[PDB]
Design a protein around this ligand. Structure first.
Ligand SMILES: Nc1ncnc2c1ncn2[C@@H]1O[C@H](COP(=O)(O)OP(=O)(O)CP(=O)(O)O)[C@@H](O)[C@H]1O
Ligand SMILES: [Ca+2]
Ligand SMILES: [Ca+2]
Ligand SMILES: [Mg+2]
Length: 974
């Protein structure tokens, strides 16, 4: 069937043979799942193996190294060994690129294993249950009645059949781009070619509900769904700080490497007088040194790390849906957080309640009761004085129960697979449903009721006696909700009424009378305080009760007189109200929450609670959690909304740096509160479960949503805790601080090692020593030192003291002033200590000719004063092996100083990072290989080192870690 939106409601239901009330039969489903199918999309596009490889080679620093292997391939085509130059530049570009793809792949496998763990549900009306029940989204088929309410994600494609709120509002941005939400209706839109945005009696799979509650008929599932047809269609702040460093570093290399080509312009004797052949060889060196000095693996490591971070986060059950959100989480200096569903288990049960007992003047006693039942199950009982009572004996309790049943958008739903009761709709409203089951104010025989019909059994006895004509949906500005009811019994002594529940402070202002069991009397000021005081110690008490009031309108307007189009008129219609009673709820803090406030205070992160609840309740939970001490003075650290607006901006910006608790706060104020916290240069993260945290979740630099929370809240946030495990946030912060720490050690290794590679070329030129390396050797120390050894730094373990330092400010220079000195001082030695390897053979070593120092400086001059020395000895391949080995081993040793920033090699030993070992062995193996295997030393121009040379190679290398160890000591001891 096509063009559902042009046909009327009666037409679309008769097409499937369903009625709106009872829904779809068990036979009807299996037939339609045959003709249509499971309501899902198949497999995924994912990534082909080649796309991952190609985006790796798209990068400035990797292109230039490809060219230097084309140059080295063009020149090697005229050599009449030079063919190894391009092959060995290709080698380091392929090692560093292989690790990046493996991490990307087996992390991609991790996010999809987590996202598709918990099965999406959908509320339907089928004939096996007289009540609403939630099934898997996939077993929904074109035909069955679907119910949706605020925060819900639309599970299929639905023709609206009746809105239960006065208006219904939808966020269709995923499918239409519409940033703002939209309204809907049930009448038919006749334009049959109408685009999706003008299909206004329709919902679409994938979109969310911004406000209201409705139900409709499913018209298309699976791939025939409006969003499923389009299935085939289709820079972090550190990376930008790193790319600025990537270009500006190559600038000084180009200079240093053009310099290295001008200094040796005089040398040409060994080339055959051809300055055309003389200057070709050094363009090969300026390229070889440029290749060697360039951090080729810098790009491949950044994305390897963010890939590894998403892997570790999915293992902790956190869906990361925005790649820069883990890095940003490191610099977080304040963590705003919702209360009810986020800091709190969101598992409610009414456990206290009261109606009025008698009112005489300013005096008044009240009947308090206690209800048992921690969970949502409708099993439990009602005590007065710790003994059970029949609630039908107290008239005011009968009314209290009427208001909870009829002013309720929610119901209980028995999950026969799990054997529990779950909430259809919102927690608060469910706790009232579960309460009218425990009260049973009409003495109705629940003897033989299935566990399914036990959930909403007594709710229906009330609903049978009252036709609910309309309902003035709950709005977070008037903090209440109303319902228009008319008794099914004829009208003579019974009339219509409104039934009101909401925040007690605001409801009781609009209460001008009080119901005393079966009678009504005017509201006095002595009774208002009996109530507000009971509310106070309910919320400051041990269970930190969350509580609301309940009132009845005894003379409401008529259905016609009421103007229901502007929501600002709802509060006007709930005004001459009669107080009935209050209920007190239950809501434990999540178990791991308290220990997280302690770990964040310790890491320099302020946590602030933003909530809409009572201030008493709010502060009382900050005392349980530990935001406040059990005896702290919260007089300037905790404000309601109105108390923060009635403030001078001098002492209102004073509050935004000290206060740790903002209560009675609307979705705008949370957004404004984050705004203030940002204007003080603080990276804020916001944690929310519900529809009122959505404006605040976008505003924060990181928004974190709860897994069991609404879809409208997950849609607004960069990370999702599938767990509900609040400790993951702190772990996510530790991971983000761990990634930034690891870029610096990578920098500290490549910068310190490779300045030495340059310092030693600008040294042998200064002393007129014979040149120390040939292109094919610099391209070997390049491959062997700057490749897998450097990339392995991305797996360093966290600093032993990583979560006790405060957050670092992103408005810094990447590299400190001291750090720059530390790079040079080590690499200054590295260049020096490898030139002395060539000098050691030439003078002090027993195996080399003890040539005079004068003679080595002017070795070109050889022969009156340089007499006694053979001439060809100066180009022996002995000093070139002796330096190239010291380089690779010095660089290997200096690769171990990059395990931690200042933790010495004893507190953090080299076996905490196993992979950095495997690379140093592989490169030392590769070096040992071209140094000892049969035909290889000829290509690289090296002599196999004997046994005692290495004891002088080591004797020169190990001092490079003794140097940095003393640099590390001065770092932490200041
Ligand atoms: N269906 C409902 N009907 C009447 N009142 C409701 C209601 N749901 C919530 N309220 C009341 O409105 C007040 C403010 O609503 P809001 O949702 O913003 O805060 P909250 O405490 O309910 C959740 P949070 O801690 O995430 O802010 C609540 O304190 C509650 O007393
Ligand atoms: Ca390099
Ligand atoms: Ca190097
Ligand atoms: Mg909430």
């Amino acid at each position: 069937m096509e063009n559902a939106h042009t046909k009327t409601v009666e037409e679309v239901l008769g097409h499937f043979g369903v009625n709106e009330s009872t829904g779809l039969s068990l036979e009807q489903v299996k037939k339609l799942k045959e003709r249509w199918g499971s309501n899902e999309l198949p497999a995924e596009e994912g990534k082909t193996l080649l796309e991952l490889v190609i985006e790796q080679f798209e990068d400035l620093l990797v292109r230039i190294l490809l060219l230097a292997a084309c140059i080295s391939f063009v020149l090697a085509w005229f050599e009449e060994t030079a063919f190894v130059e391009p092959f060995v530049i290709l080698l380091i570009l392929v090692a560093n690129a292989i690790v990046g793809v493996w991490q990307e792949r087996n992390a991609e496998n991790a996010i999809e294993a987590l996202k598709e763990y918990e099965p999406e549900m959908g509320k339907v009306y089928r004939q096996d249950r007289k009540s609403v029940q939630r099934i898997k989204a996939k077993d929904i088929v074109p035909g069955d009645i679907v119910e949706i309410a605020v925060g819900d994600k639309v599970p299929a494609d639905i023709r609206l059949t009746s809105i239960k709120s006065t208006t219904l509002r939808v966020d269709q941005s995923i499918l239409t781009g519409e940033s703002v939400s939209v309204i809907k209706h049930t009448d038919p839109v006749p334009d049959p070619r109408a685009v999706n945005q003008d299909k206004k009696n329709m919902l679409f799979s994938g979109t969310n509900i911004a406000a209201g509650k409705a139900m409709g008929v499913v018209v298309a599932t699976g791939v025939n769904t409006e969003i499923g047809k389009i299935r085939d269609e289709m820079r972090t702040p550190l990376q930008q700080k790193l790319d600025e460093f990537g270009e500006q570093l190559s600038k000084v290399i180009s200079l240093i490497c053009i310099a290295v080509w001008i200094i040796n312009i005089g040398h040409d004797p060994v080339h055959g007088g051809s300055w055309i052949r003389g200057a070709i060889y050094y363009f090969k060196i300026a390229v070889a040194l440029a290749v060697a000095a360039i951090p080729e693996g810098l790009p491949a490591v950044i994305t390897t790390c963010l890939a590894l971070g998403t892997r570790r986060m999915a293992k902790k059950n956190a869906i990361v849906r925005s790649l820069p959100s883990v890095e940003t989480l490191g610099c977080t200096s304040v963590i705003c957080s919702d209360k009810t569903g986020t800091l709190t288990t969101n598992q409610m049960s009414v456990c206290r309640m009261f109606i009025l007992d008698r009112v005489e003047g300013d005096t008044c006693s009240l009947n308090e009761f206690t209800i048992t039942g921690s969970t949502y199950a409708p099993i439990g009982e009602v005590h007065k004085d710790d003994k059970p009572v029949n609630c039908h004996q107290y008239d005011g309790l009968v009314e209290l129960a009427t208001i909870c049943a009829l002013c309720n958008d929610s119901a209980l739903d028995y999950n026969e697979a799990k054997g529990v009761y779950e909430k259809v709709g919102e927690a608060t409203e469910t706790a009232l449903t579960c309460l009218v089951e425990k009260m049973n104010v009409f003495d109705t025989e629940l003897k033989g009721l299935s566990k399914i019909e036990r959930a909403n059994a007594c709710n229906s006895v009330i609903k049978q006696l009252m036709k609910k004509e309309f309902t003035l949906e709950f709005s977070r500005d008037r903090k209440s909700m109303s319902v228009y009811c008319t008794p099914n019994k004829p009208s003579r002594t019974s009339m219509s009424k409104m039934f009101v529940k909401g925040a007690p402070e605001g409801v009781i202002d609009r209460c001008t009378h009080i119901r005393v069991g079966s009678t009504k009397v005017p509201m006095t000021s002595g009774v208002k305080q009996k109530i507000m005081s009971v509310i106070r110690e309910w919320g400051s008490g041990s269970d930190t009760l969350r509580c609301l009031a309940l009132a009845t309108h005894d003379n409401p307007l008529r259905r016609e007189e009421m103007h229901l189009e502007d929501s600002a008129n709802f509060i006007k219609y709930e005004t001459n109200l009669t107080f009935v009673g209050c209920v007190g709820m239950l809501d434990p803090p999540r178990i791991e929450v308290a220990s997280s406030v302690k770990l964040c205070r310790q890491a320099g992160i302020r946590v602030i609670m933003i909530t809409g609840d009572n201030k008493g309740t709010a502060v009382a939970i900050c005392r349980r959690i530990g935001i406040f001490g059990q005896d702290e003075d919260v007089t300037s650290k905790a404000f309601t909304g109105r108390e923060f607006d009635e403030l001078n901006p001098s002492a209102q910006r004073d509050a935004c740096l000290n206060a740790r608790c903002f209560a009675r706060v609307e979705p705008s104020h949370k957004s404004k509160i984050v705004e203030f916290l940002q204007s003080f240069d603080e990276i804020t993260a916001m944690t929310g479960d519900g529809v009122n945290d959505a404006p605040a979740l976008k505003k924060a630099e990181i928004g974190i949503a709860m897994g069991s929370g609404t879809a409208v809240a997950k849609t607004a946030s960069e990370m999702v805790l599938a767990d509900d495990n609040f400790s993951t946030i702190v772990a996510a912060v530790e991971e983000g601080r761990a990634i930034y720490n690891n870029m610096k050690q990578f920098i500290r290794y490549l910068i310190s090692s490779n300045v030495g590679e340059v310092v030693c070329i600008f040294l042998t030129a200064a002393l007129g020593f014979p040149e120390a390396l040939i292109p094919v050797q610099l391209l070997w120390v390049n491959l062997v030192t700057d490749g897998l050894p450097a990339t392995a730094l991305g797996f360093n373990p966290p600093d032993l003291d990583i979560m006790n330092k405060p957050p670092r400010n992103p408005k810094e220079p990447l590299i400190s002033g001291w750090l720059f000195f530390r790079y040079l001082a080590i690499g200054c030695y590295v260049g020096a200590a490898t030139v002395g390897a060539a000098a050691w053979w030439f003078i002090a070593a027993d195996g080399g000719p003890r040539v005079s120092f004068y003679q080595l400086s002017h070795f070109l001059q050889c022969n009156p004063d340089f007499e006694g020395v053979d001439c060809a000895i100066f180009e022996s391949p002995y000093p070139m092996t002796m330096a190239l080995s010291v380089l690779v081993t010095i660089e290997m040793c200096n690769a171990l100083n990059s395990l931690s920033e200042n933790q010495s090699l004893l507190r953090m030993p080299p076996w905490e990072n196993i992979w950095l070992v495997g690379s140093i062995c592989l490169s030392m193996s590769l070096h040992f290989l071209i140094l000892y295997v049969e035909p290889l030393p000829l290509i690289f121009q090296i002599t196999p080192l004997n046994v005692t040379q290495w004891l002088m190679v080591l004797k020169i290398s190990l001092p490079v870690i003794l140097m940095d160890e003393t640099l590390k000591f001065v770092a932490r001891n200041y």
